[PDB]
Amino acid sequence: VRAVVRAGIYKGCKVFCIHEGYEGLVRGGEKYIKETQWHDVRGWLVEGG
């Protein structure tokens, strides 16, 4: 996810993180579909799950 957020940002496009996978995709809204920034995926390499 860190890679997708940064790569997409670098290639000049808005990246949205769909929280709770398909549930988030079906329910929709700002609640599950949040716009993600470059600094928002900081140190995610170490993070598990």
């Binding site: 600094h39 900081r42 390499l45």
Partner: protein, 99 residues
């Protein structure tokens, strides 16, 4: 300080896996111009940390990247140039990396 000798393979991959800001490799070497540019990057990086996650900063330096600009020398230059805005410390594990 990174192992692997004249091969920059391990520092390249460790930079990707750890999220290091820079990796100094034997194939490229370390120029004073790049060192100054990279230090100014750090200066700006810390000036922009105001508000974001504090994840920490790494520079990976393969021992063979420079015989003159060594891990210890590089770090002292960072402190000199940082002008109290941040500090630099070395991490030299040694030829124990075998595992």
């Amino acid at each position: 300080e990174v192992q692997g000798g004249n091969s920059g393979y391990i520092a390249t991959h460790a930079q990707l896996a750890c999220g290091a800001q820079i990796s100094y490799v034997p194939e490229e070497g370390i120029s004073l111009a790049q060192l100054e540019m990279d230090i100014n990057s750090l200066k700006e990086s810390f000036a922009n940390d105001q508000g974001k996650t504090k994840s920490g900063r790494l520079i990976l330096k393969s021992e063979n990247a420079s015989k003159v600009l060594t891990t210890e020398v590089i770090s002292t230059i960072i402190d000199d140039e940082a002008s109290g805005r941040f500090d630099s410390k070395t991490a030299i594990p040694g030829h124990v990396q075998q595992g």
